[PDB]
Amino acid sequence: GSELPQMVQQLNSPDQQELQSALRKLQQIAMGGNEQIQAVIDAGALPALVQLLSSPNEQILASALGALANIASGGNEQIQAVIDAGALPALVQLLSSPNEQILQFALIALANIASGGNEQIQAVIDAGALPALVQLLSSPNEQILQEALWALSNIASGGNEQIQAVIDAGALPALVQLLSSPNEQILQEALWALSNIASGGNEQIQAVIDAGALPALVQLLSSPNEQILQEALWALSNIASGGNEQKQAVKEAGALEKLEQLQSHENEKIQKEAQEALEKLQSHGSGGSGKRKRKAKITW
Ligand SMILES: [Ca+2]
Ligand SMILES: [Ca+2]
Ligand SMILES: [Ca+2]
Ligand SMILES: [Ca+2]
Ligand SMILES: [Ca+2]
Numbered sequence: 001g002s003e004l005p006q007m008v009q010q011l012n013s014p015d016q017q018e019l020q021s022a023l024r025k026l027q028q029i030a031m032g033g034n035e036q037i038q039a040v041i042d043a044g045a046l047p048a049l050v051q052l053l054s055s056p057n058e059q060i061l062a063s064a065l066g067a068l069a070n071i072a073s074g075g076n077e078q079i080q081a082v083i084d085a086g087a088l089p090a091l092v093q094l095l096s097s098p099n100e101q102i103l104q105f106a107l108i109a110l111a112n113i114a115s116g117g118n119e120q121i122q123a124v125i126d127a128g129a130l131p132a133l134v135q136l137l138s139s140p141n142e143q144i145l146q147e148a149l150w151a152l153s154n155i156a157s158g159g160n161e162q163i164q165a166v167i168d169a170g171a172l173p174a175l176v177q178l179l180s181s182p183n184e185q186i187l188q189e190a191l192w193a194l195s196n197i198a199s200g201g202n203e204q205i206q207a208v209i210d211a212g213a214l215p216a217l218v219q220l221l222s223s224p225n226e227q228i229l230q231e232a233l234w235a236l237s238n239i240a241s242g243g244n245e246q247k248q249a250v251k252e253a254g255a256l257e258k259l260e261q262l263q264s265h266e267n268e269k270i271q272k273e274a275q276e277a278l279e280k281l282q283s284h285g286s287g288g289s290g291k292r293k294r295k296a297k298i299t300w
């Protein structure tokens, strides 16, 4: 209510303690759902938060990133408000920060923006985020790699043009190599990203096939880990939503026998997902692939 305007004014306070305190309060209010996010936006916070993305004060910067990430966990129009206030160029530049905490928070903010509609995703692409994000797939820092992967996965949850930008930026070879990761968190994210890419057109699905994903996906159908099994099933199921060449590549990789067997798994979600993938592979006709988006909040 009547304290938000003061909090917004304090984002320019010459008292650093008042400034920090207002920033933290806005960050926390924006954890409270879309009506609370709207009240923050309506109070005028966005221009000041964006401006603070240039601050050389790391405490300010980390809290500003948290506040913006939380705002961008709202509705597509709330995300669009962040984009319209100018946040993308500053966020993209922060992908080159040598400060791993700042980098992680920038990646989460960007990933949340890329969880909006196709226009919001396209704004992330147009700001030049893709080559940085693909380069971060090489990081030996698991925390950074994980947040980059979610940002890429979210971009690939757009339309065929957005998916094609992810392909054109060279993400597929790294994503396919990550299907061999012994790290289950990384593996899950690599599966989300590849499944979202395979939610596009037949030519996008074919690029996933051509990058070599099928042998690893078929091997994951033997996993005793029910979460990984469902993720591999989802990916195969999106691929099987293609045309005849795509369906035939899945058959040539040996999937049919395993999918048939997984119809007898005790877990009902696995049963159902295996049955659905099998029906698509044996059907004439196409479509029925699923896209998924991830939103995350930054709170301390
Ligand atoms: Ca001062
Ligand atoms: Ca500093
Ligand atoms: Ca560092
Ligand atoms: Ca490491
Ligand atoms: Ca492991």
Ligand SMILES: [Ca+2]
Pocket: 224, 225, 226
């Ligand atoms: Ca198990």
